[PDB]
C-alpha cells in the first residue's frame, strides 16, 4: 500500500490480530509497522488554500 | 385520528349588532427565519484526484466542469454574504443607547446588549445563539474547506444593536432621513395612532402597557429558554450534503476498488485508464449532484433571505398596516435579533382581549338629517345612545362636531331618532 | 491570476488559485524480510505430475517470492497474468499463494 | 488571522469602508507609499441619540430626494438544438 | 453604475462560452471531431468514441439546462419584484418603508432598461433638527386635552402644537385638540393655557 503523508507517533493501541486501520472517507489514518510493531498516525501535509 | 381543524364556533351575526373591546392585550410573537448558510467550497483536485498525476492529466478534458463548479461556489458565497449584509445592514450609521433607562415604564434590558457579559449580546440572543448546536479536519483533509463569514457574530450583533437603538430612541424616522429623538410612550401612542386608537387610551393606562410587554418579553424569554427549528433544518440539509459528499467516496462505481493508490498499486495504466476514468465520471456525476442541490438551497436562502430583509424594512424601520405580515395582529413595532445562520424578529402586536355585544345603527336622525360619524360607531347601551372609537369602547355623547351630516333620513334603511347634544 | 481568468486586465476582487502543497523527497518501505526462499524448481520441473481432475495442491508462505529464476530455466509457452501486472508482483504482498 | 494567513498587506489600527472583502471581518484596500492594506472594517458614524422622557426632534426644513435602483426582467432568448450541437 | 445589468448578460454569454468550449473535449475520446472520428475509423469500432462524445456534450449540454433554469428562477423573482415595485411605487403612492427609496415615498419613475428596468423614486427626506420640550397632553383647568394629528412642542416660553414631520407653530386651541379625562391620570401632563376665541 503506497501513500503520502506524515507519520507522526499515536497512543490508541491496535489488537494483535488487526493491522490495518480506517475512517469515515476509506483512507489509511493509523498503521503497523512489521517489525517495530508500534502504531503511527497518517496525517496529509496537504491542508491549505490559496 | 381523523385531524380537527381548531375550535368550532358560530358568530351570533344580526343586522344590528357589533363586537367592541373593552380590554385589550399586548403580546409579542417570534419568527424565525434564515439569512444565510455555511459558505463551502469544493476544489475538484482533492476531492476527485487528490495528490494523483494521471488523473490531473485526465482531468483536463472535464476542466471547464470543474471550472464551472468553483464558479457555482463562488457564486454562491458572495450571495450568502450580501445576503448577510442585505439584511443586516438598513442603516449606515450605528446608534446607542444612552445610560438612562428611564423609558416610561417600559423595560428594555433582556433585548439590548449586555456589557457585563464577555461577548456583546442581549441574554436572549445568548440563549438563542446556545438552542443551535453547529470532523471538521477530516473533511478538510479531503479537500471540503469551509469559508468564513464576511460578517462577524460581533458585527451582526452590533447592526442589531444599532437598529435596536434606532427603534426606542427614533422608532421610524431613523429609517427614512435622519434620527429625530422621541420619548417612548409617545412613540408607541404613535403606533397606535397608526392603527386607530387614540392617544389617551395609552396616556390613561401606559403602566399597563409596560407591564403588559415587559411580562410578555419575560415569557418570550422562558419559552425560548424552555423552537428554532428553522435555523436548525438548514445547517441539517447542508451537513447531511457535507457528509453525502464524503460516503460519496468508497463507491467503487463499477470499478476494482475507490482508492486510486490502491489502484495504481496493482494496476498498469493501459489497463487502469478506463477503471480511473469510471471514477472520474462517477465522482464528477456526485460532485455535480452537489452543486445542483446546493444552488436550489441557494435559491431557498435567497427568498428567505429577501424576506427577511423586507420584513426587517417593514417592520422594523416602520409600523406597517400589512395584515399577518409582521405577526398576529395590529402591528405596533418589531425588534430584530441575531441568530446563528439567520434573524429572529419580535413582533408586538396589538390583539384586543374582551368584547361585549352592542345595539348599533349606521346613522342617526336628529331633525330631518342623517348624521353620520366621522371616524368611530354608534353603539347603545340599551337606552342610550353612543359614539365610541373601533377599538375601544370610549362612552361619548353624540355632539355635532363627532358625527357630519349627509342628506335626509328616510334614504338609509337602519337608522333611529336620537338627540344630538349641540352644545 | 490572469492565468486562472483567462483575461490580461484583471478587475479587482477575490479570485481562487491552486492551493499550497508539500512535495515528498523520500519514500519508507515496511516489508518484513525472510531468510527462506520459496519453492520454484521442483514445482515448475517435478518428476511427475498428477492429472487435471486430481489437480495438486500446493501452499506457499513465509517466504520471498522472485520470478527472475523462470526466466533462465526453460522457454514457457504462455506467461498470462489477469488482474495485476506481472512487471509489479515485487511492488506489492503477496497473499495466499496457491498452486 | 481567522480568515487565514495573509501576506503582501499591512496590518493599520484604523477603520474603513469595506473595498475588497476578505473575511472575518477583515476587507483590503490600496490606499494607505501607497501599498495594500488591511483592516478591520467599520460599520458607520459611532454616536448616540440624545435621548430624554421630554425632548423632540422636528424637522424644519427638508430635501426632496431622487434615487435610483435597478432591476433586471428579462435576458437573452437562447435555443439549442442537439442534431447541430453533439452532432452535425 | 449598472451592474444590474451587466452581470446577466456576462453570465449569460459565459456560459454560452463555456458551451463552445465543451466542444473541443475529447471525454476520453481519440479527438474531438466526429469529422475525424469517422474519417480515421469504420463504424464498427467508432462506436464507443461517438457515444462517449454524445455523453460529454450531454453532460455539458444538460449543466448548461440547469444553470439555466436556476438563472431563469433568479430572474423570474427578480422580475416578479420589478412587476410588484412598478405596481405599487408608479402606480399608487406606498406607505410601506424602504421599499420605494429611502424616506417617505412620494412617486416613482420607470425608465426602459437592457434587459431590465430603472426606478426614478422621488423621496421625502427631512432635513434639519431643532430640539423641543415636549408632553403629550396639557391641562387647562382639569381637562386633559391631547392632540388630533400633531404633537404639542415648546420653543422654552409657549407651548405651541406642530405636526411630527414639519415644524409649523400654531396656538394651541380646543379645536385642534381633544378633551379625554381629568389631568392625573398622565404622568408627563403641563399646565397650559388654551386662549378659546
Given at each position: ?50 | ?122 441574554p436572549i440572543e445568548d440563549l438563542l445563539f446556545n438552542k443551535v448546536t ?290 | ?29 515496511r516489508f518484513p524480510n525472510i531468510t527462506n526462499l520459496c519453492p520454484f524448481?521442483e514445482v515448475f520441473n517435478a518428476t511427475r505430475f498428477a492429472s487435471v ?47 | ?88
Open positions: 500500500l503506497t501513500g503520502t503523508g506524515v507519520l507522526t507517533e499515536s497512543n490508541k493501541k491496535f489488537l494483535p490480530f488487526q493491522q490495518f486501520g480506517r475512517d469515515i472517507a476509506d483512507t489509511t489514518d493509523a498503521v503497523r509497522d512489521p517489525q517495530t510493531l508500534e502504531i503511527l498516525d497518517i496525517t496529509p501535509c496537504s491542508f491549505g488554500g490559496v | 385520528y381523523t385531524m380537527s381543524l381548531g375550535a368550532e364556533n358560530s358568530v351570533a351575526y344580526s343586522n344590528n349588532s357589533i363586537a367592541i373591546p373593552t380590554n385589550f392585550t399586548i403580546s409579542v410573537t417570534t419568527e424565525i427565519l434564515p439569512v444565510s448558510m455555511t459558505k463551502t467550497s469544493v476544489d475538484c483536485t482533492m476531492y476527485i484526484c487528490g495528490d494523483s498525476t494521471e488523473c490531473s492529466n485526465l482531468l483536463l478534458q472535464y476542466g471547464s466542469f470543474c471550472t464551472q463548479l468553483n464558479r457555482a461556489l463562488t457564486g454562491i458565497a458572495v450571495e450568502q454574504d450580501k445576503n448577510t449584509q442585505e439584511v443586516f445592514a438598513q442603516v449606515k450609521q450605528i446608534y446607542k443607547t444612552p445610560p438612562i433607562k428611564d423609558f416610561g415604564g417600559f423595560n428594555f434590558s433582556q433585548i439590548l446588549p449586555d456589557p457585563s457579559k464577555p461577548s456583546k449580546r442581549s453547529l470532523l471538521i479536519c477530516a473533511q478538510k483533509f479531503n479537500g471540503l474547506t469551509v469559508l468564513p463569514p464576511l460578517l462577524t457574530d460581533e458585527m451582526i450583533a452590533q447592526y442589531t444593536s444599532a437598529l435596536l437603538a434606532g427603534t426606542i430612541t427614533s422608532g421610524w424616522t431613523f429609517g427614512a432621513g435622519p434620527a429625530l429623538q422621541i420619548p417612548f410612550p409617545m412613540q408607541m401612542a404613535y403606533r397606535f395612532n397608526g392603527i386607530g386608537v387614540t392617544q389617551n387610551v395609552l396616556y390613561e393606562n401606559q403602566k399597563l402597557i409596560a407591564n403588559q410587554f415587559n411580562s410578555a418579553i419575560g415569557k418570550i424569554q422562558d419559552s425560548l429558554s424552555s423552537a428554532l427549528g428553522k435555523l436548525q433544518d438548514v445547517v441539517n440539509q447542508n451537513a447531511q450534503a457535507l457528509n453525502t459528499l464524503v460516503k460519496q467516496l468508497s463507491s467503487n462505481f463499477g470499478a476494482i476498488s475507490s482508492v486510486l493508490n490502491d489502484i495504481l498499486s496493482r494496476l498498469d495504466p493501459p489497463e487502469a485508464e478506463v477503471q480511473i476514468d469510471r471514477l472520474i465520471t462517477g465522482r464528477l456525476q456526485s460532485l455535480q449532484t452537489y452543486v445542483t442541490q446546493q444552488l436550489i438551497r441557494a435559491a431557498e436562502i435567497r427568498a428567505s433571505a429577501n424576506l427577511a430583509a423586507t420584513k426587517m424594512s417593514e417592520c422594523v424601520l416602520g409600523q406597517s398596516k400589512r395584515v399577518d405580515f409582521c405577526g398576529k395582529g395590529y402591528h405596533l413595532m418589531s425588534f430584530p435579533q441575531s441568530a446563528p445562520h439567520g434573524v429572529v424578529f419580535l413582533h408586538v402586536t396589538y390583539v384586543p382581549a374582551q368584547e361585549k355585544n352592542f345595539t348599533t345603527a349606521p346613522a342617526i336622525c336628529h331633525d330631518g338629517k342623517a348624521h353620520f360619524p366621522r371616524e368611530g360607531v354608534f353603539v347603545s347601551n340599551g337606552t342610550h345612545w353612543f359614539v365610541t372609537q373601533r377599538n375601544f369602547y370610549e362612552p361619548q355623547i353624540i355632539t355635532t362636531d363627532n358625527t357630519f351630516v349627509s342628506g335626509n333620513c328616510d334614504v338609509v334603511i337602519g337608522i333611529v331618532n336620537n338627540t344630538v347634544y349641540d352644545p | 491570476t490572469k492565468c486562472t481568468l483567462k483575461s490580461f486586465t484583471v478587475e479587482k476582487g477575490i479570485y481562487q488559485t491552486s492551493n499550497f502543497r508539500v512535495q515528498p523527497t523520500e519514500s519508507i518501505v524448481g481432475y486430481a489437480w495438486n495442491r500446493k501452499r506457499i508462505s513465509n517466504c520471498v517470492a522472485d520470478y527472475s529464476v523462470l526466466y533462465n530455466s526453460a522457454s514457457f509457452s504462455t506467461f498470462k497474468c489477469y488482474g495485476v501486472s506481472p512487471t509489479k508482483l515485487n511492488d506489492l504482498c503477496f497473499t495466499n499463494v496457491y498452486a | 488571522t481567522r480568515a487565514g494567513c495573509l501576506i503582501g498587506a499591512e496590518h493599520v489600527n484604523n477603520s474603513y469602508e469595506c473595498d475588497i472583502p476578505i473575511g472575518a471581518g477583515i476587507c483590503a484596500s490600496y490606499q494607505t507609499s501607497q501599498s495594500i492594506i488591511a483592516y478591520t472594517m467599520s460599520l458607520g458614524a459611532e454616536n448616540s441619540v440624545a435621548y430624554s422622557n421630554n425632548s423632540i426632534a422636528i424637522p424644519t426644513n427638508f430635501t426632496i430626494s431622487v434615487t435610483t435602483e435597478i432591476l433586471p426582467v428579462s435576458m437573452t432568448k437562447t435555443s439549442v438544438d442537439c442534431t447541430m450541437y453533439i452532432c452535425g
